[PDB]
Curated annotation (Swiss-Prot), chain B:
Subunit architecture: Binds to host ACE2. RBD also interacts with the N-linked glycan on 'Asn-90' of ACE2. Cleavage of S generates a polybasic C-terminal sequence on S1 that binds to host Neuropilin-1 (NRP1) and Neuropilin-2 (NRP2) receptors. Interacts with host integrin alpha-5/beta-1 (ITGA5:ITGB1) and with ACE2 in complex with integrin alpha-5/beta-1 (ITGA5:ITGB1). May interact via cytoplasmic c-terminus with M protein. May interact (via N-terminus) with host bilirubin and biliverdin, thereby preventing antibody binding to the SARS-CoV-2 spike NTD via an allosteric mechanism.
Source organism (scientific name): Severe acute respiratory syndrome coronavirus 2
Effect of mutating R1K: In strain: Mu/B.1.621
Domain of life where this protein originates: Viruses
Name of the featured protein: Spike protein S1
Job of this protein: Attaches the virion to the cell membrane by interacting with host receptor, initiating the infection. The major receptor is host ACE2. When S2/S2' has been cleaved, binding to the receptor triggers direct fusion at the cell membrane. When S2/S2' has not been cleaved, binding to the receptor results in internalization of the virus by endocytosis using host TFRC and GRM2 and leading to fusion of the virion membrane with the host endosomal membrane. Alternatively, may use NRP1/NRP2 and integrin as entry receptors.
Length: 49, 49
């Protein structure tokens, strides 16, 4: 089991779908299309800002 | 000013270069609802109009 956690600005939360390009993903971390697993995402404006 | 539902405005675009790379961030395109053509590979097809 591998949990990979980070924080991204809320404009492209739905871009992290596998096999998709995007400036926050194609130059930081990309995901293979044959990936199996789950995605969890939520807003954290008040804990960080 | 935009148009009404019964009087929507219709514009044909021709004789230019389909470049949606700058259309990614600017005009952020909140909907990924493209089903006839996959929007990730939009730049690889040529449209007569």
């Amino acid at each position: 089991v591998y949990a990979d956690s980070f924080v991204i600005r809320g404009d492209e939360v739905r871009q992290i779908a596998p096999g998709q390009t995007g400036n926050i993903a194609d130059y930081n971390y990309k995901l293979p299309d044959d990936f199996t697993g789950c995605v969890i995402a939520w807003n954290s404006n008040k804990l960080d800002s | 000013r935009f148009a009404s539902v019964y009087a929507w405005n219709r514009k044909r675009i021709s004789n230019c270069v389909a470049d949606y790379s700058v259309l990614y961030n600017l005009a952020p395109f909140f909907t990924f609802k493209c089903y006839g053509v996959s929007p990730t590979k939009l730049n690889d097809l040529c449209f007569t109009n």
